[PDB]
């Protein structure tokens, strides 16, 4: 199934929603597009407008809140969108960062309608939408140089991993006696900017993290339990041909989808040894 | 702004990525070696012919016990439920001519004899019992119609024998139209008997027939007769008991699989599948959801199925779950939109 | 032509003679010591009250057996046949607590197969196995719960087949169970006769013919086994005057020999023995339920003759009328008396 | 039950029918009389006549041949008369002897309609009455001087009868098909004078009993047991009865002796347990 020419400017993100039927894209044209794919057909449904700069990413929210989509852009802001009564409209706007926002992600539906945001300004913001609408977020300084990604850990006590341009990967946990997310662990292992970080939703004892970097390597970080440390495990002994840009875990099977710069997508799974191989 | 597939996974096991031209989106369902939609199950669940499915599990069974269950199901497949419970619950001087003189010797004899002739059949027995002339007491009674008398002796026989003879204790029960005694103390080895004493005493009262059959199954399974307790359950129509046994046997089963060179996932995956196919085929021959863990694990197989893209087989199991459970509710809705 | 009484005896004990004046005739009935008209018997037979005769005979009885006889007659005359038979045939809950306890189990192919028959609701075969094996009570306890007959008895016949010869009580049970008494009448100890008697009564309450046939059979045994007085009892109750006539007709010769020794002439002996034989019989013959016996007839005809000689033509006629008018002797005699008395 | 003055002349015999309901008296007046006796009544019927001399004795025949009474007189003739239609007629007249006939008794019906005649003509005759009327007589000499009695012996040949002599001798006679007539057997002696009368008993008991009375004024009871056995002479008493002895009669049963004397007194006798005799 292919939807050629969804945009005329280069596209940076395409995400299907909770039912994996409703597509959504974003690119330099500074717009988002909603699609409806079936067998091998497709129908545009709208074009979201507002961002003053190329749009970097989008994330669909859990259906239990409505039909929402979040986006972030080089313009250093985040826009939420809604499809009420049959038409999309900018409900809220989040802009507390002073540089390009590169990632945005809806927390687990159990936490409510929270949003995880990371920016080149080095900070990360956590945002909920009050009873009235406005937003009173959490802002933390999380990386030097710039933050490129941030992902939520599955639900139990709330944790999320960030990936900065300081080559570091970082786990965060919420604390009461601070009313903020505090730095739980710093994981060193990349020699160049970390482009993305994905926390696997696998519900097994062991937790899985996958970080991708400008150094042409993918690292799977794992933690057996609370007393265990985060163990480093290169996805493969040899570096890759080009820069790895994204990492995505399936919802089941704990299968990793790696997006390279040689515009190639490799798939991996774990084996008896604890080493990865092509799935 | 650099170019990149920006790949993502989505429900149904779909992979979304960006074309190299950087202007197109491509959704697909990658082939994950090891993961395959369950056709056999979908096709057998519709054509209700688990011959192939059963033949599959049988030919690739795991431990010895597991083999019995599938065999139990392999034969239950051909012979049918009724015919099965049959082959499974069945089993492998007059005259005297008097001669010569004789005489009433003793007071006892004389007293009883006089009673008789004097048409006093009642006293004869009293005088008999109050002596160890039970054999006789019984003979006289085996001639009258008077029930209370025709019974005052039985209760007299048992009174001093039902404890020195197993057959005596059994008679005591057959006599007094009961099974409680056998069902609870007769050696489990002779169960196919306590089995016939239930179908015999309660031939027109099914609720009781099955309450007893159950009471026995529990005893068998709890005293080394696993395979047999299942047979009794299969006849009492208590899928719940068979389910409970199988849910407790689950762990150890997933462990024997994990030691068989399989990743935590291959084991967990394979296990839940075998259990679900084993439970489905079994629930298809008995007379039978309200068990939490079973539900819990039912939901689990749903997700593994949706991830295969086989939304149809997923809905089938969705239906069988109580539309009273929210998780069941939510997934029911999700699977709908995802497929519809 | 010389005067003379020219006497002659004549039928009826009449003596004829010419009177002293030699011109008339006298005809009388002389007194012969020891020869009187039996008035008590005439009365008794007319009244039907033998109390007086019974007592006269009871005061000077000969041997003891005879005394017992008249003694019998005495009691029989007061209490009456029926009340005599009632007094001469007359005779001088438990533990249930079983509670099944502990684990048990069938052991052996026997215990195990019977039960298979019980639950399998195959009661028929369960009984057979219990029998082919010496599990008697077992078979009984079982059949005693069924309402089948052909089976309910197979157990019984087995009980008899091996215990009847080993226990008297068992043997008694046999006959009762089989509704018979032949065995008891024929082989049971003649000492328990009151039990047999009573047994015969309870089996043939509506078959008086059978009852009497049995009572007479039992009667014969008692007699043949030194139980003379009891045999008379069973014979009486069976209304068999024949048998009592035989016992008595046979003990006759000896009786007339003991009277012979009492320093009595041939006539004296014969006469008293006969009269006493006849009295005892006429009496007893009144409380029974009844003349064909040949021997008996000849004596009645012998009593008739002694009778007519005492002159008592009336009494004589009474006896002649009890004989079969088919005997040309009884026929001829009737004529003579008739003509002589009327 | 007296029948006062039945005759004019002294009476010589008082005999009754087998049923003691009708009598028969005979006297010197040469006449016999038939009677009816009841309770004490005496109805006189016919009076038999055709006898020339005094009638001596008479005897009733067995009813078996109807009503017949035979009489014997001094006239040397015995006569019998039947009673067809309630009216007495003379049937036949027997007169073979030459002189008085003093006794005539009938034979036990078994034997038949036989009559035994004993005359003082010393002989005795036996006569049975055939059909047509003509009989076949049998006569045989029996005593010296004469014959006074001729009683019969019960039935058992084997036909016996005792005779009393005018010559003091008592005899026994038994038929004999080879002799054609009764021949002698015994000859019991015992009386010193004449044998007035002799009667034979019907008592079938073990031994035979015979009575013999005579002018010798004594009775000799002749007891014998069997063929061989001799007759045992026996004095009815070891003394003399004051007068003669005319008649001796045997009772039907109980075997008692009727001894009609001459002193005009009748005496009865019985044999006590030993074997002797006593009154009654």
Residue numbers in the entry:
A (entry chain B): 2 to 157, 170 to 292
B (entry chain A): 378 to 469, 495 to 690, 694 to 745
C (entry chain C): 378 to 469, 493 to 690, 694 to 745
D (entry chain F): 2 to 157, 169 to 292
Question: Which text from the study accompanies this structure?
Answer:
COPII mediates Endoplasmic Reticulum to Golgi trafficking of thousands of cargoes. ER export is mediated by the coat protein complex II (COPII), which minimally comprises five cytosolic proteins that form two concentric layers on the ER membrane—the inner and outer coat. The inner coat layer consists of the small GTPase Sar1 and the heterodimeric Sec23/24 complex, whilst the outer coat layer comprises the rod-shaped heterotetramer Sec13/31. Here we visualise the complete, membrane-assembled COPII coat by cryo-electron tomography and subtomogram averaging, revealing the full network of interactions within and between coat layers.
We next analysed rods that interconnect vertices in the right-handed direction. Surprisingly, in addition to the CTD appendages, a second region of ill-defined extra density was present near the Sec31 dimerisation region. Upon classification we could divide the right-handed rod dataset into two classes, both of which converged to resolutions between 13 and 15 Å. Analysis of the averages placed in the context of individual tomograms shows that the extra rods are sparsely and randomly distributed. This leads to extra outer coat rods creating a bridge between canonical rods. Such rods ‘glue’ mismatched patches of outer coat lattice together: they might therefore be important for outer coat stabilisation in a context of flexibility and adaptability. Due to limited particle numbers, the resolution we obtained does not allow us to precisely define the residues involved in the interaction between the β-propeller and the α-solenoid domains of Sec31.
